[PDB]
Design a protein around this ligand. Sequence first.
Ligand SMILES: CCCCCCOc1ccc(C(=O)N[C@H](C(=O)O)C(C)C)cc1
Lengths: 244, 252
Amino acid sequence: ESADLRALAKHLYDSYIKSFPLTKAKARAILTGKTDKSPFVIYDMNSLMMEVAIRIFQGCQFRSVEAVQEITEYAKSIPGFVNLDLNDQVTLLKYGVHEIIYTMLASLMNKDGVLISEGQGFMTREFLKSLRKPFGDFMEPKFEFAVKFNALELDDSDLAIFIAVIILSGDRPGLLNVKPIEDIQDNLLQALELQLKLNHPESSQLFAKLLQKMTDLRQIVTEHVQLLQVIKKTETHPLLQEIY
Amino acid sequence: ESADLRALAKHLYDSYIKSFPLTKAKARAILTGKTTDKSPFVIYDMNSLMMGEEVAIRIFQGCQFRSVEAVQEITEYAKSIPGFVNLDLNDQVTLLKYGVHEIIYTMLASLMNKDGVLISEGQGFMTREFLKSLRKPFGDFMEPKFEFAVKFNALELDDSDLAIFIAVIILSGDRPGLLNVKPIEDIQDNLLQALELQLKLNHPESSQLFAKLLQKMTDLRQIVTEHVQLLQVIKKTETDMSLHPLLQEIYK
Ligand SMILES: CCCCCCOc1ccc(C(=O)N[C@H](C(=O)O)C(C)C)cc1
């Protein structure tokens, strides 16, 4: 029934808006859209100031922890999610949040850099590439993914449903009851397909193209966690370890 | 029009049957009760292994050979995909380089069940437990392929579905280093329309099978990525082990 599918779409859109402060629509206005208060631009060490690589890294960590809580709130609004086994809800968020972070990060990126701090700042791609060894390879693969992903020209109403699809995967390790998860994801996939078909009537197979982006996305996450483990041999703040 | 898409699907199934000597139909026939006109000989230990005729490397070289053959069969198939041989020659190479192992592991699932895998064009059957028990790191080689295959075969796809899916894999366009992405995209969009119709027609009760199948491309990518890491280990522990130049060229 096309009626519960669009009820589902609107529901997810509304809660996406509620949960995530900076929407793609707003970010685009600030980015390549040329809006009311341009972002402060960080393009070098001097602009940054107004111990670099580490403090940038730690700032990204702070932001990612905030993002985990926004994503968590959003997840609990996906119909059926809270009714799942509690351990499974934890497992889904645990393995899903990285994929979602980089997906949503794309909304704040163009080929030349990324919005930071509620959209108040813009950090250039080239500046990020110029960071001391380990740290300069951090964001580059995320930029490469973002350019490809942004070529799809999704809006927030599309992204809301896609994010929900990622969360309800089914193949996360250690899941206790895979069936209701895949049943919910089947429904979200139906709602996503219909959404892209209505929202983007002239973009053939947009649904298929979007699902294929998950392949690059998961590689990116795998490579990132690999990198994350290498900085445990670079610099090796009490209660702070624990927070992160 | 739906009709053009059916004709494309028929052409691809046809080319598939002509390119790949052991179909899923035949493999499932061998694996199940079924056709007991050609029951396979089963390899589950060393002694049965020599009846069928180091132990771990010999099997690995046997498997390298099957890889180089599979690259040929896949290349012959790729040529049948409408538009493929018209592409920039460099992009033909790139598509094959990145597509070949994702296809090999897709098709390998057709030859597997939870218990083992068909070998030697279906004349033999090698146990999953036997493979797992191989020395060193050779025992870790096939196990994630089995894990994928038991999940992949739960989609209950047949050869007519697989023919189009395998073409979609080849014509990716998010492949690294492609010169002209647009014509590749146009071909894949046709192939995807063809695949979506095929699944809706062949599996009308199977909800969102199309999406579920596309999601499996994530599993394939991860299998390849892990398999490459395992090979880098093998070549450094066994300095006397030889990898085929074709395969070396595919890997980076
Ligand atoms: C497309 C036809 C599929 C034939 C299936 C062959 O079964 C295989 C299963 C595994 C492998 C495999 O991992 N080969 C490796 C590779 O090519 O990197 C190594 C052994 C050469 C090769 C073949």
